[PDB]
């Protein structure tokens, strides 16, 4: 699991997200942190660890680093690369690596854990030519680091 040097690096990041000065964060923010610290949980994976909180408490329940930590752990002990390349291979109707811009935004904003168009904009910023095409390989490596 985790040692002291790691506990300080994580608690440093954790207090940056405290927008009140109580040493705690909102239940909703827990997702942010985990991603900030190198993880990639599905919003579902996040919710399980929180307790599958109802919306009345997802915007009001605060948590110290002591209680956040088991949740950060839980996601740690459940998280390939080839299968990422095969997933983009799905949305590819040509074979040339080149995928439409309109058809990538669409699926990303109306499927699975739907993302806002603004989030989808900031990410695909400039990674597309005049024809509205994007070599996923280029894009896949970028997003991972």
């Amino acid at each position: 699991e985790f040692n002291k040097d790691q506990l300080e690096e994580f608690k440093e990041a954790f207090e940056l997200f405290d927008r009140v000065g109580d040493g705690k964060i909102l239940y909703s923010q827990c997702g942010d942190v985990m991603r900030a610290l190198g993880q990639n949980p599905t919003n579902a994976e996040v919710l399980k660890v929180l307790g599958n909180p109802k919306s009345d408490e997802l915007k009001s329940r605060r948590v110290d680093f002591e209680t956040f930590l088991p949740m950060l752990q839980a996601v740690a002990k459940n998280r390939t690369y080839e299968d990422y390349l095969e997933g983009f291979r799905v949305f590819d109707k040509e074979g040339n690596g080149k995928v439409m811009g309109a058809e990538l935004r669409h699926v990303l904003t109306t499927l699975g854990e739907k993302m806002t168009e603004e989030e989808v904009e900031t990410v695909l910023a400039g990674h597309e030519d005049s024809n509205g095409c994007i070599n996923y390989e280029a894009f896949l490596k970028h997003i991972l680091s």
Binding site: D32, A36, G38, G87, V90, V107, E113
Partner: protein, 750 residues
Amino acid sequence: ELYTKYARVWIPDPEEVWKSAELLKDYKPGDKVLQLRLEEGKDLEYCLDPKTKELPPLRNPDILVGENDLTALSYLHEPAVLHNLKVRFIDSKLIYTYCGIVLVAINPYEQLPIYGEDIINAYSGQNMGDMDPHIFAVAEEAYKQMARDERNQSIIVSGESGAGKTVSAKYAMRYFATVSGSASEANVEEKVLASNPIMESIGNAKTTRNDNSSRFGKYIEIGFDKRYRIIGANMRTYLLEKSRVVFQAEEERNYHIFYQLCASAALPEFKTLRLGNANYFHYTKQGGSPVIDGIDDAKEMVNTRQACTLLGISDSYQMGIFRILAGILHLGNVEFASRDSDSCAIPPKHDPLTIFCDLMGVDYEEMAHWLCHRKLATYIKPISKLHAINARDALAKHIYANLFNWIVDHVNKALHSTVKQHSFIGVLDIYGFETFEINSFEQFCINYANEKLQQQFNMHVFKLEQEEYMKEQIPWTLIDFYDNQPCINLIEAKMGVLDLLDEECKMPKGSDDTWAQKLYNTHLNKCALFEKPRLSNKAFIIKHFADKVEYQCEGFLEKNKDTVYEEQIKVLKSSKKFKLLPELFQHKKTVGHQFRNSLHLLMETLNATTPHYVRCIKPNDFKFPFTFDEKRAVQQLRACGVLETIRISAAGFPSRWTYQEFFSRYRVLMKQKDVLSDRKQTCKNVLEKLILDKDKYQFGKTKIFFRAGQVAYLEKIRADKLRAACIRIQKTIRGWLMRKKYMRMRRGDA
């Protein structure tokens, strides 16, 4: 299995009949309750009926919803049809949809720009299945198949009164008129449409559920020459509600024309007719509903008379009709008084009878004699009080039937063509399954007719399925025919319901109660299409095509009697003040047997054609523009065969993709290697792996035939893939952008 988390279903709803729901957790086998989410969020635990353990119907995936043809849908069941027709209607102003060979037409209650010349041309010379559904498309197919087979066509337009059957016909004509050559002084359309006010006055009436219901089948034949051009028309009537002429039940009137006559009583030209208001006459008062909200019966007369003028019933003859109808009306009030040895007689100098005889021009005394007497052949004999009344009504009914046939013969003269006729397309305007709370003889007759018609249709569809199944080389013995002959037979065979009724009638002592018991003795248990209310001995149940219908035996016998005394007709045939009254006229007759006759006559006519089908539907009960009541709609479908036809369809292989189509939408499910140079063959390999059980589809020359729920399953796994691929990329971007947001805020950017 198929009921996984996030998949949706339809559960019952008192307001909207069905309501959507989503599965919160995967359905585990043997579970007692599902966990669902409604129109206001996650809330509810749906309980499964322990005796069936059955699950609620499944929703189709969106890519199949909104289609031009219901049979395209994988999960083909009541809510699916109901939803799918709702979204087209409400969210795309689309009133026409196919159900296989059937065109469903939902009354928009708003005029649309989809009937002009430009749109007619666009349908001109196209194939049905390459143009958006339209009444026009059904017309074009008729005109096509005509030449392509040297065969006359019947377009059969059915639906409840007010669903728009009349409007549908009106536009199928215009098509046929515009796409033919046009005739100059004919412009047939216009003449025929002027006939409508006439036919509606003598053939339509107010009922408990409808202000303007046709109580008959109209069949306008459109005549065509050797060079296929509109020359003339030919109206044929059938299935008339003779009973309605002397009986009405609560909140129902007699045929309009009688009321357009009373309301026109204080008019000059109509003073000889000598008419009060509608509460006066027995044959117009019985219902208690003298006036229809929002109709000036008098202004409708004005229009009625005007239409007679347009079709060439000379003003002289117009007075000829009204005069006969006045007499029928006075005839009605002839009261009878019982005398010694079960006989009767008419009170001295009877006001009603005097007026009846004056109008008709016959000897008062000769008639008064024959209303109470009978020729037992050659000894004269009196008749009881009740037999005189049955015979008075028999005569009122007989006259009307003839005057009704007369008007049709002379309307026809205005719609007839000198030019000889090669072929025709006839449009039938008929009713569908009637079903009130109290059902009587009138309804029984209607649904009898509808069982005859839904039998032709069943057959037609079965032959077309065969043909299509052959064109693709698929075992032709995989089509189960649903045979509705047992029910027809229960109704119309010997020892059947109409036959026993016709027996009990010629019994002197007979009654509705004994006829009810004779039905039980003869049929109860011996036949599964017949049942009996548990707490009544005065009502039966027949399981018809669409649903079950409890008839009430009260009234059946008297309505069914229709025996006219030969003497009474001779008195009228021998008139010398009325040119028309003789012109009408040229063991034991009965309304039921008569109905039957006309019915068979009609099914002949129609079997000497290839029929087309338009089912009309009223979507709401207040004439509202594009407004869809789910309660009304679903009623209207059931009593229209639709949901049952579809119930049949979903038994076989209703889904039908071409190999090209399958291949496109499902290239993505295939492992890149599986793909071959032969795309047809490729599909054969992939579909055997993805869907195991090989009884779930069949491979044809150019198309794959699927069982119900199967394409849905393809579209679930295809959905499952793309969903799992997206969640992957998404969680990644969610992380990339959170660390970019960190790296900034780490260096005090806030």
